[PDB]
From Swiss-Prot, chain A:
EC number(s) on file: 2.5.1.6
Cofactor(s) listed in the protein's UniProt record: Mg(2+)
Organism this protein belongs to: Methanocaldococcus jannaschii (strain ATCC 43067 / DSM 2661 / JAL-1 / JCM 10045 / NBRC 100440)
Oligomer status and interactors: Homodimer.
Gene3D superfamilies: 3.30.300.10, S-adenosylmethionine synthetase, C-terminal domain (3.30.300.280)
GO BP terms, alphabetized: one-carbon metabolic process; S-adenosylmethionine biosynthetic process
Family note: Belongs to the AdoMet synthase 2 family.
Coiled-coil ranges per UniProt: none
Pathway membership: Amino-acid biosynthesis; S-adenosyl-L-methionine biosynthesis; S-adenosyl-L-methionine from L-methionine: step 1/1
Reaction it catalyzes: L-methionine + ATP + H2O = S-adenosyl-L-methionine + phosphate + diphosphate
Protein name, as recorded: S-adenosylmethionine synthase
Length: 408, 405
């Protein structure tokens, strides 16, 4: 009986698959932009766990500022050289010290050391061929603010925070064939199973998908680790080996479509100018990176779907509307898309400033129905799903801190 | 050429119930970074042209602003901690004299730091670039394979540096024009000279619901020009009236509400006061490609590209060229009779000439009682016209005749 501003509307347009063209991009884990997103969010999570240990609540912070400066290297067949380390600057702000006037005590939290440690551990986790001791410099200019113990006491209540702004979030489901193919391609090429078989495949993998009717062209930029290819011959074999595996993958999840696969199209086998790297990432020299310039929270870049321009990674998981709403929108859309009769679902949430974040000014649910289905039969199920997620909005916070949802 | 044209049968933008549009003004920390990034690129282009008569490889689309600290006060406050800015990205740092067998270093560092400081002085009137701002530089040499692609056919038609897409659309909706022109007006020299209290950090958000547009402005006020809270209120109300008169010009028929600095607390005198005219002094951070698209707007009800045009080289970086190109094509197609709305998406393939996109995608919402088959060939010609004159895009960018944010 709790009445929210939820809107369910029938959408009478062509579903995504029936539209003639589609363009989808994904920047893989080792791409400099995705490295920065990953670090930003890993630092946030680390700081959250820090605050939770000491106070049992999360204090205010935002670490959605991370700059990766390309290093210096000299790739060579058989093994190249890393000349200058990658430089990474951690920025943002985080609550550092707590002033307690009553008991006359001052607590200070390991903001800087936690941040640097978290960033370094994330790099070790994803980049197989980067020695973080010598190949990376992690610097930190995160602001260290103070806070009254009184406000900490209020935070420990863990009530639903009030929306500090009029902001929005957007999501949709399900993923189209192209979207699924782009996503799973990057995931597969960065899976441990494949790396074991083809160690030459670096983590800096970028996948572009172009659908023309029922034909999908995949264009892949794949950084090759030079110590695993002793000449151009072996380099070529890596490309064709990967190609065949991606062909097999496309036949599993995009059967019925015509699939074309292009890899490292900028290569020139004649001049021996190819996508060769020492560390398996263009972060080593070729390409710089920063936060919020790549994937959206659903892990994709989709100019045929609605996209928020806000960078979710590193944002305050407590009271940043944009981050929470973009994740929540994608969680709601995903569940509604499972409902019988729903072919396509779009969710948009708009906050009411001054009101709890789970009491939005408007939540729009647009549904393309399957044939012979009545939107009015779906609507009550859909509104229930939305209200359920809104009721459990604090659990969504936990999911983020526990890394159970993606921010890029 | 791979030019695709489609009729798009959806509700036009103005007829949609809800519309949200944002613009970050020139003084906003994110737009500062975008502007600095492009200023560095333009400067390096000029420097390379002077020494070699050609533009050498670079991509300075990386600028990080770490917020400083300040202490604003009625009549004039003071900075406490300087604003740290890091110039980053790629550039041709040196050339090898194979004949003399010596490396010759190019003035990238001095050129970049100078271009950065000059831009700040141009967009932030009340900043002291000596004590308020620190500008560091870590621009480095680009990879060997990237420079190779850049040099393969620079003399002919350049080869795409990468596989990327830009987007564009036309025309602008009433809400979009209102947001865009609101910021531009308040950040115009004519206005700021009239009302020196108006800082350049102006964020404008437009929320349309039906035929009602709520215009929300966050405007930094320069504290040296407001002696008290009363004078502060006078600035707010004076700007408000200016925006009202503007709304009557370009948003006739719409109920336009105007909210300025909604977080202000007049009782506690806790308002949007600044020393420098930017929230960069308030510990707020900024970086490149976190704000406006090349059309100058953030538009979730429109298609967008995540590529950041600012700082990228105007020679072979499709992430810049195609976003500018898509906008140019969209504008022309929108002029055609029968075209209500136009959407242009241009995809590259790394290694292929920039005038040979993997796909040049066009969508058109036709006016009522208009055939797409009549408009279709008109659209292709416009697209072909521009691809034939793709080198003019570089020219327009280097000559600073187009915005990147």
């Amino acid at each position: 009986s709790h009445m929210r501003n939820i809107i369910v509307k029938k959408l009478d347009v062509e579903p995504i698959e029936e539209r003639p063209t589609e363009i989808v991009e994904r920047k893989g884990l080792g791409h400099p932009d995705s490295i920065c997103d990953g670090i930003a969010e890993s630092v946030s999570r680390a700081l959250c766990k820090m605050y939770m240990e000491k106070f049992g609540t999360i204090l205010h912070h935002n670490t959605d500022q991370v700059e990766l400066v390309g290093g210096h290297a000299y790739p060579k067949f058989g093994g190249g050289v890393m000349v200058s380390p990658i430089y990474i600057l951690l920025s943002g702000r985080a609550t550092m010290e707590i002033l307690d006037k009553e008991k006359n005590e001052v607590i200070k939290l390991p903001v800087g050391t936690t941040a640097v440690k978290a960033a370094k551990e994330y790099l070790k986790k994803v980049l197989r061929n980067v020695d973080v001791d010598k190949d990376v410099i992690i610097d930190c200019r995160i602001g260290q603010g103070s806070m009254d113990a009184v406000d900490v006491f209020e935070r420990q209540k863990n009530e639903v925070p009030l929306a500090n702004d009029t902001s929005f979030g957007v999501g949709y489901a399900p993923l189209s064939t192209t979207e699924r193919l782009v996503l799973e391609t990057e995931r597969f090429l960065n899976s441990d199973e494949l790396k074991n078989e083809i160690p030459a495949v670096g983590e800096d993998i970028k996948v572009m998908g172009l659908r023309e009717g029922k034909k999908i062209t995949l264009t892949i930029a794949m950084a090759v680790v030079d110590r695993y290819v002793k000449n151009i011959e072996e380099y070529k074999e890596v490309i064709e080996k990967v190609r065949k595996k991606v062909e097999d993958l496309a036949k599993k999840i995009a059967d019925g479509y015509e699939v074309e696969i292009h890899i490292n199209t900028a290569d020139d086998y004649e001049r021996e100018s190819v996508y060769l790297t020492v560390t398996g990432t263009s972060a080593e020299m070729g390409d710089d990176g920063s936060v919020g310039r790549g994937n959206r929270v659903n892990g994709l870049i989709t100019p045929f779907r609605p996209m928020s321009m806000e960078a979710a990674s590193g944002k305050n998981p407590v009271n940043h509307v944009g981050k929470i709403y973009n994740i929540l929108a994608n969680l709601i859309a995903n569940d509604i898309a499972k409902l019988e009769g729903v072919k396509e679902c779009y969710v948009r949430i708009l906050s009411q400033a001054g009101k709890p974040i789970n009491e939005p000014k408007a939540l729009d649910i647009e549904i393309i129905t399957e044939d012979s289905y009545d939107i009015k039969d779906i609507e009550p199920k859909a509104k229930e799903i939305a209200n359920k997620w809104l009721d459990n909005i604090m659990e969504v916070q936990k999911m983020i801190v526990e890394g159970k949802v993606t921010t890029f």
